[PDB]
Design a protein around this ligand. Structure first.
Ligand SMILES: [Mg+2]
Length: 861
DNA sequence: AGGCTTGGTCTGTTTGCAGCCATCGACT
DNA sequence: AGTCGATGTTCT
RNA sequence: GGUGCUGGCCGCUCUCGCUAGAGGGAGGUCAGAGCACGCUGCAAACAGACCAAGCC
């Protein structure tokens, strides 16, 4: 079967070093360091020079100046050298040649494997297959197919090679040797192939990381000045004229500031609102051409101004990369540096043959590690144990499973504390089938039919919905060609469900009073300004905030110190529950979550008590205390969300998730999840722990997955006071279920639909739809080039003719099979919204039921 | 008391570049 | 047999 | 048995202060383990947090 390896690495703290290495490391982080800032100029990279006063703005012409002013003669070769260096990969086979002083060349090109296969079948190979092999080969075109053909007919295969190798050689490999002598280039060590071979690719490994950014950072400047001057309307002609006369008067302009300006200026309103400076400038004649603008044609003139102002804050070219910080030095078995390795008294040892031996410590991640050398790879076998602090604890150390893997190179780094670490970039022999199916089959709209036939009969899926509430609600399922069932999967068949959907981490107990503890910090932020706003006016304080302050046993009624006792009593609460949760190791994520935010508002509060005394206009330059906690903690919770999500998804082959970082609706900027814990870092941290077990992961859209009904597709209402419940109107009977459960089904639904079944899209006139939108209109109604008609009851119809009466350039919603419009999707929400308000009784419907024959959401048949 | 816009200073958050080497030929 | 230098590819 | 994460106590220092106290910060010190673990360099865009004004 086909396998695919997965790159991972975990630390190893080095204790002692032996030999001349210490100088050796310091030389590479000085040889790298030394020449990287010189090679910067050779490709003429336009660079800002970092400075406290600003950033100087050097241009390519101001940098191409010193290219020939630094190399008068190597220029005509260096440009050929940089390309054969920027291509990289390995066909640049020996770029190290310039550093190595004894660099020898051979007069023959090497006998490559693909260079052998081409000669023995030179007699019969067709020219419409001979020329498609060589055209794409760097060494083969240099001889035209004429003299290629003659040797195949006359000569037996083995004789031909003896006379073509000095002809098809890649003459770029000499470019390195010339530059050293013509430039007087000396490194620190020069007969040492290791020192050279590593350093060449190492500096290159840091440089190519800058070239592709360079042409990509630029190609944005070419796409940004295209999409600012493509939407210049007579509405842009006066929208930016609004901010010019706003900054002179010392003001600015926002987004939701926009809609209450014309509604108060279209009826004589003599009592201003928060935007009177706009309303008084929305009564002048030069901005009276703005009050009369349309509905949607102004959202497409707000983004350009919100896009143009990003063109002006952006620098014209990248900064200069700072190279002083130590880089992760890699050393590999074959070709690069040479190393051997052992486990000495369960303590790791590393040996480098020319330059002496490192020393190493016993590690917990590799708990029962073993090593056996094979000629190309190291084979490791180990498991994960726990970390053993207590000696007479009844507590067994958690045993991980054994891991069979391969390892071929090692990494080294100094940390700012002066410690040398050692890394192990290891590869995992795992089945590629799950990944192979993941990208090609579920991600995309239509896979080729030779790919669809790459499926076994039955396989397992999963999904969940994650919001800040009770985070994980999974559902496992079974999909089958043979087996019939209630969920429709595109191109694979029907499926029937094993477990789920259930919530797995319900919000723990201590949360209820920790939010109640957050409110205690909520009032301290608004109250500290009351001590600071009456210091400027001369007034006293409000009793309602004062009455709250007295709730503490405070030995002084002074307003100042009672503030401090509500906070010391608050810090103790955080200090205490810190301890009693540290006992556990944080086994309830849902608990630590509302605690994490509680740890946030406390640190967010101490920055206003240090700045209480400050008279108006003098600040405190709060410095980095390199709080190591808040950074390396909120990571731990994410790498702990894996364990609860992996445990329930081990037996699955594929997983699905809600990608909350995509084109979402408007309420997702203030949302805490983009603020509290990264979606993609969490989804990727799941992927990294899912890839580890050879289980594919494929995201799907985030557009209204919580909203739709899994059974009937009809709309629902996420209760605006209780986000955990959601309501539905079907069959003249009201129903209710759990929202963050509902989302798990709609993600499982949309997953088996390849995200094809849409939620909302924008019309045009038969500006094209994406390839994932097409397969819906073609499969159901008949084609892609279709206009849409408003019809009886205010529905929408798909017409196979293309008339001009119809609505074009608008927006829709999809429910149960019917294409409905926007003024109806409000009405449809309005249908449930009113029934709940009138205090009617609904019927809860679990989705674990068997009475359901088929789920009709995101399926078309 | 609260509700935005502007800017500065400081960390913190979310991304796409580079990478995780095999094989012959000369020589022991 | 074995070491270490120097050399080899191409689709999205 | 490598990196994380935690509270008391001690002083030390720092900041304010209706005088009551609080809050930091790198280390010296008393307590707790059913806690997961892709390491790393260059780069770029937002948002988050506090002091200032004008404005309704
Ligand atoms: Mg949700």
């Amino acid at each position: 079967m086909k396998v695919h390896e997965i790159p991972r690495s975990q630390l190893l703290k080095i204790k002692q070093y032996e030999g001349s290495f210490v100088e050796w490391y310091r030389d590479l982080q000085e040889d790298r360091k030394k020449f990287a800032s010189l090679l910067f100029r050779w490709a003429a990279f336009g660079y800002a020079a970092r400075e406290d006063d600003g950033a100087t703005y050097i241009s390519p012409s101001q940098a191409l100046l010193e290219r020939r002013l630094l190399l008068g003669d190597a220029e005509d070769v260096a440009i050929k050298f940089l390309d054969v260096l920027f291509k990289g990969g390995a066909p640049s086979s020996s770029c190290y040649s310039l550093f190595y002083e004894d660099f020898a060349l051979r007069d023959k090109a090497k006998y490559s494997g693909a260079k052998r296969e081409f000669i023995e079948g030179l007699a019969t190979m067709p020219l419409d297959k001979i020329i498609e092999r060589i055209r794409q080969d760097e060494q083969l075109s240099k001889i035209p197919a004429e003299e290629w053909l003659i040797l195949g007919a006359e000569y037996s295969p083995e004789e031909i090679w003896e006379q073509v190798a000095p002809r098809i050689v890649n003459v770029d490999r000499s470019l390195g040797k010339q530059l050293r002598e013509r430039l007087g280039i000396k490194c620190r060590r020069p007969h040492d192939a290791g020192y050279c071979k590593i350093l060449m690719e190492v500096v290159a490994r840091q440089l190519r990381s800058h070239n592709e950014t360079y042409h990509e950072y630029l190609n944005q400047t070419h796409e940004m000045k295209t999409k600012v001057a493509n939407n210049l309307t007579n509405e842009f002609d006066l929208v930016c004229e609004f901010a010019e006369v706003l900054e002179e008067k010392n003001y600015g302009l926002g987004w939701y500031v926009l809609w209450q300006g014309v509604k108060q200026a279209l009826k004589e309103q003599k009592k201003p609102t928060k935007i009177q400076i706009a309303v008084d400038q929305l009564r002048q004649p030069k901005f009276a051409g703005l009050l009369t603008a349309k509905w949607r044609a102004l959202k497409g003139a707000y983004d350009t101004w919100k896009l143009k102002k990003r063109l002006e804050k952006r620098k014209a070219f990248p900064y200069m990369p700072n190279w002083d910080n130590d880089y992760q030095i890699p050393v590999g078995l074959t070709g690069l540096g040479v190393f051997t390795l052992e486990v000495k008294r369960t303590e790791v040892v590393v040996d480098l043959k020319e330059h002496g031996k490192l020393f190493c410590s016993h590690s917990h991640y590799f708990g029962d590690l073993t090593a056996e050398k094979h000629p190309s790879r190291y084979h490791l076998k180990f498991r994960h144990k726990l970390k053993l602090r207590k000696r007479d604890s009844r507590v067994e150390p958690t045993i991980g499973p054994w891991i069979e893997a391969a390892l071929r190179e090692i990494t080294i780094q100094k940390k700012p504390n002066g410690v040398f670490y050692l890394g192990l970039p290891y590869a995992l022999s795992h089945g590629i089938d799950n990944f192979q199916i993941a990208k090609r089959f579920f991600s995309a709209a239509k896979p080729d039919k030779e790919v669809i036939n790459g499926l076994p009969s039955e396989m397992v899926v999963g999904a969940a919905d994650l919001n800040l509430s009770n985070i994980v609600a999974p559902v496992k399922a079974r999909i089958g060609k043979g087996l019939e069932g209630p969920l429709h999967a595109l191109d694979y068949g029907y499926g029937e469900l094993i477990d789920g959907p259930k919530i797995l981490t319900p919000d723990g107990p201590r949360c209820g009073e920790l939010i109640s503890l957050k409110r205690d910090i909520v009032e301290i932020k608004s109250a500290i300004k009351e001590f600071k706003a009456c210091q400027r006016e001369g007034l006293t304080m409000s009793e309602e905030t004062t009455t709250w302050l007295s709730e503490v046993e405070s030995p002084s009624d002074s307003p100042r110190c009672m503030i401090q006792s509500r906070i010391a009593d608050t810090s103790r609460r955080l200090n205490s529950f810190k301890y009693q949760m540290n006992k556990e190791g944080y086994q309830d994520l849902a608990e630590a979550l509302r605690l994490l935010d509680a740890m946030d508002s406390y640190n967010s509060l101490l920055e206003s008590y240090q700045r209480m005394h400050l008279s108006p206009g003098e600040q405190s330059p709060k410095e980095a205390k390199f709080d190591t906690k808040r950074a390396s903690f909120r990571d731990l919770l994410r790498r702990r969300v894996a364990h609860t999500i992996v445990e329930y998804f081990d037996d699955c082959d594929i997983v699905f998730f809600e990608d909350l970082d995509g084109p979402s609706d408007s309420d997702s900027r203030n949302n805490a999840l983009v603020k509290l814990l990264s979606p993609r870092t969490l989804l990727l941290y799941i992927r990294q722990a899912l890839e580890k077990r050879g289980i594919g992961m494929v995201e799907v859209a985030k557009d209204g997955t919580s909203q739709n009904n899994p059974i009937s597709g009809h709309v629902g209402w996420r209760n605006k006071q209780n986000k955990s419940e959601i309501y539905f109107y079907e069959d003249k009977e009201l129903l209710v279920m759990d929202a963050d459960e509902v989302g798990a089904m709609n993600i499982l639904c949309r997953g088996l639909n390849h995200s094809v079944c849409p939620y909302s899209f924008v019309t045009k006139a038969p500006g094209d739809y994406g390839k994932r939108v097409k397969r819906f209109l073609k499969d159901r109604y008949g084609s892609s080039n279709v206009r849409f008609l408003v019809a009886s009851m205010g529905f929408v119809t798909v017409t196979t003719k293309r008339p001009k009466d119809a609505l074009v350039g608008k927006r829709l919603y999809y429910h149960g099979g019917e294409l409905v419009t926007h003024d109806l999707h409000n009405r449809m929400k309005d249908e449930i919204k009113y029934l709940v308000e009138k205090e009617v009784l609904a019927r809860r419907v679990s989705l674990s039921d068997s009475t359901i024959k088929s789920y009709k959401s995101f399926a078309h048949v």
